[PDB]
Design an enzyme around this catalytic site. Structure first.
Site, PDB file in Angstrom:
ATOM      1  N   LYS A  63      80.580  71.092 -21.952  1.00 19.54           N
ATOM      2  CA  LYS A  63      80.682  69.790 -22.655  1.00 19.54           C
ATOM      3  C   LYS A  63      80.288  68.632 -21.727  1.00 19.54           C
ATOM      4  O   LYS A  63      79.563  67.762 -22.185  1.00 19.54           O
ATOM      5  CB  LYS A  63      82.105  69.613 -23.178  1.00 19.54           C
ATOM      6  CG  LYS A  63      82.767  70.878 -23.690  1.00 19.54           C
ATOM      7  CD  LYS A  63      83.210  70.800 -25.127  1.00 19.54           C
ATOM      8  CE  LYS A  63      84.326  71.779 -25.416  1.00 19.54           C
ATOM      9  NZ  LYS A  63      83.939  72.784 -26.432  1.00 19.54           N
ATOM     10  N   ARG A 174     111.317  54.436 -15.611  1.00 19.34           N
ATOM     11  CA  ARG A 174     110.212  54.588 -14.673  1.00 19.34           C
ATOM     12  C   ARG A 174     109.485  53.269 -14.378  1.00 19.34           C
ATOM     13  O   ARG A 174     108.388  53.291 -13.817  1.00 19.34           O
ATOM     14  CB  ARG A 174     109.225  55.630 -15.204  1.00 19.34           C
ATOM     15  CG  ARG A 174     109.870  56.984 -15.451  1.00 19.34           C
ATOM     16  CD  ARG A 174     108.875  58.093 -15.716  1.00 19.34           C
ATOM     17  NE  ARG A 174     107.655  57.626 -16.359  1.00 19.34           N
ATOM     18  CZ  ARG A 174     107.327  57.874 -17.617  1.00 19.34           C
ATOM     19  NH1 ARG A 174     108.131  58.557 -18.420  1.00 19.34           N
ATOM     20  NH2 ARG A 174     106.171  57.425 -18.083  1.00 19.34           N
TER      21      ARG A 174
END
Ligand SMILES: Nc1nc2c(ncn2[C@@H]2O[C@H](COP(=O)(O)CP(=O)(O)OP(=O)(O)O)[C@@H](O)[C@H]2O)c(=O)[nH]1
Ligand SMILES: [Mn+2]
Ligand SMILES: [Mn+2]
Ligand code: NA
Ligand code: NA
EC number: 2.7.7.7
Length: 320
Positions: A63, A174
């Site tokens: 690809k 986070r």
DNA sequence: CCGACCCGCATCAGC
DNA sequence: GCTGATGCGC
DNA sequence: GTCGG
């Protein structure tokens, strides 16, 4: 930039495999390749360069090659224009509509949100809510609103019982400057992995959040996991805040640390830590870690990291 | 040649 | 009614 | 789809 064309193509291919082909391992393979390619500190000028990378094989090499030489991938071109396939893919953006429901809808000619709207009788409760809040649930939540959300949750939880402990985890814990939803971890001393000395511990909390009109809708609710909708209160003649997704998980007070690592994420990080535990000869879940043998002991998040020979990475760095 | 790939709740299938 | 399986999102 | 038994 950043191998962006290849990474975008691979994520688009991943989405097609999940939503249309119902091939979950292909989706994950494409996501893994994309995330390794996104980490690559060089610009890929060939499929084989890419192939040297872990998670990239012959097909992804094929690809990258077509894409580099044409700026396009015929398969995606065809897929994007395919009415059936594009609709199935679109409909899965409604929360509660997965690949199967989306294919069943498109089967009967229901392909758009408008089709969904005039077909309420064909939606379950979750799907009707995903549809009502479709725009809102794709909106991001600024950290400033997150903190106003945390104030309310923490205020109302302690108002039910001062002994509860609520921790906002997910991208929030986070350091993200914006979040997709609110994840709340809940502990109470009555609920421990050994005994449940009180019932309704999660219910009372949801009820309270509903009474003060913070929680507005329920998608799923059991003894230990709530999935729902909430909304910050507005000011006089002020545009109403968007509706936001909220999840609450009641963890036994003695497995709080496994809970925080779990609900702190990220999801790609988690399955990269879980896939590392099995090769170090360990198993990881939100409750325990095990060699599966008895519950290996824990009283810190770094305790889990040493077990599998991983240097502690701060919540801010678990954004894999 | 082929099998593996990181749990809670709502709803369905079927007895 | 009930269990067990599957869809969905985590 | 990719990896490895
Ligand atoms: N072991 C797994 N843990 C997951 C998975 N998905 C999510 N999680 C864990 O739950 C935590 C919250 O998941 P969310 O779906 O809300 C995504 P996250 O909080 O990380 O960011 P947002 O887009 O801002 O909501 C996540 O960080 C971790 C998964 O597929 N497997
Ligand atoms: Mn989240
Ligand atoms: Mn969430
Ligand atoms: Na490779
Ligand atoms: Na969906």
């Amino acid at each position: 930039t950043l191998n962006g064309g290849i990474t975008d193509m691979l994520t688009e291919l991943a989405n097609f495999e999940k939503n249309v082909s119902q091939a979950i391992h292909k989706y994950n393979a494409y996501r893994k390749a994309a995330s390794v390619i996104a980490k690559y500190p060089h610009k890929i000028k060939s499929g084989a360069e890419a192939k040297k990378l872990p998670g990239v094989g012959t097909k992804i090499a094929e690809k990258i090659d077509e894409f580099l030489a044409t700026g396009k991938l015929r398969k995606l071109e065809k897929i994007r224009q395919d009415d059936t396939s594009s609709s199935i893919n679109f409909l899965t953006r409604v929360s509660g509509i997965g690949p199967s429901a989306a294919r069943k809808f498109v089967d009967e000619g229901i392909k758009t949100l408008e089709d969904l709207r005039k077909n309420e009788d064909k939606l379950n409760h979750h799907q009707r809510i995903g549809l009502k809040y479709f725009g809102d649930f794709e909106k991001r939540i600024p950290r400033e609103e997150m903190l106003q959300m945390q104030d309310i949750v923490l205020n109302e939880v302690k108002k039910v019982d001062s002994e509860y402990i609520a921790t906002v985890c997910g991208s929030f814990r986070r350091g993200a400057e914006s979040s997709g939803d609110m994840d709340v971890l809940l502990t109470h001393p009555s609920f421990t992995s050994e005994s449940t000395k009180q019932p309704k511990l999660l219910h009372q909390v949801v009820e309270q959040l509903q009474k003060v009109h913070f929680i507005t809708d329920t998608l799923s609710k059991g003894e230990t996991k709530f999935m729902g909708v909430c909304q910050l209160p507005s000011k006089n003649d002020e545009k109403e805040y968007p509706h936001r997704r909220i999840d609450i998980r009641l963890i036994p007070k003695d497995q709080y640390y496994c809970g925080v690592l779990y609900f702190t994420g990220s999801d790609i990080f988690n399955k990269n830590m879980r896939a590392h535990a099995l090769e170090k000869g360990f198993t990881i879940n939100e409750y325990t870690i095990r060699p599966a043998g008895e519950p290996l002991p824990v009283d810190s998040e770094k305790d889990i990291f040493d077990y599998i020979q991983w240097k502690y990475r701060e919540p801010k760095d678990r954004s894999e």
